Amino acid sequence: KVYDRCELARALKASGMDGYAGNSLPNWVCLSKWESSYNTQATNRNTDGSTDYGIFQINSRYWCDDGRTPGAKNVCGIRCSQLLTDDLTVAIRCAKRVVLDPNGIGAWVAWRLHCQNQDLRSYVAGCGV
Numbered sequence: 001k002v003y004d005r006c007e008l009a010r011a012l013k014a015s016g017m018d019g020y021a022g023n024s025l026p027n028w029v030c031l032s033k034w035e036s037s038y039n040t041q042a043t044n045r046n047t048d049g050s051t052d053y054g055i056f057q058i059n060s061r062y063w064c065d066d067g068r069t070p071g072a073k074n075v076c077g078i079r080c081s082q083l084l085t086d087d088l089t090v091a092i093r094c095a096k097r098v099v100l101d102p103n104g105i106g107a108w109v110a111w112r113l114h115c116q117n118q119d120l121r122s123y124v125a126g127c128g129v
């Protein structure tokens, strides 16, 4: 499913993502926008054999099992396939686990590049959240 910006915002707010580990809502909308363009079925293969999965583009080397990534750890304890569903429950739960590591929201290259040290007010504007 390709989420509408405000449709996503409402779904993340409802899942407790606003302030999750000190990361306000606009941070998560900004990273979903630039990581996948709000598409839960987005996939991206890397040089090293790993693949990025879903709306938050979670890597198969540490967080999920896709059966073709060499030396993977599956810390989220899921199949990567579970990150591409229209239903965000599993993606949210894994993303929640990703920001608990020391690097936090800095784990996401799109966040560091287009959201970090920017005015993200516009990503939630008009959503009524």
Ligand SMILES: CC(=O)N[C@H]1[C@@H](Oc2ccc3c(C)cc(=O)oc3c2)O[C@H](CO)[C@@H](O[C@@H]2O[C@H](CO)[C@@H](O[C@@H]3O[C@H](CO)[C@@H](O)[C@H](O)[C@H]3NC(C)=O)[C@H](O)[C@H]2NC(C)=O)[C@@H]1O
Residues within 6 Å of the ligand: 044, 046, 052, 057, 058, 059, 060, 062, 063, 073, 075, 098, 101, 102, 103, 107, 108, 109
């Ligand atoms: C949001 C997702 O999937 N992001 C992960 C991933 O994602 C991408 C995704 C797309 C790209 C693209 C398109 C291009 C490009 O150049 O790079 C990418 C990296 O690749 C990073 C590789 O460094 C991971 O970051 C690395 O990931 C784990 C998660 O924490 C680390 O292991 C953990 O390291 C910390 C030390 O800080 C410990 O606390 C824990 O022991 C440990 N493992 C566990 C299980 O928690 C490691 O350090 C950290 N790497 C560095 C060098 O930043 C980050 O998680």
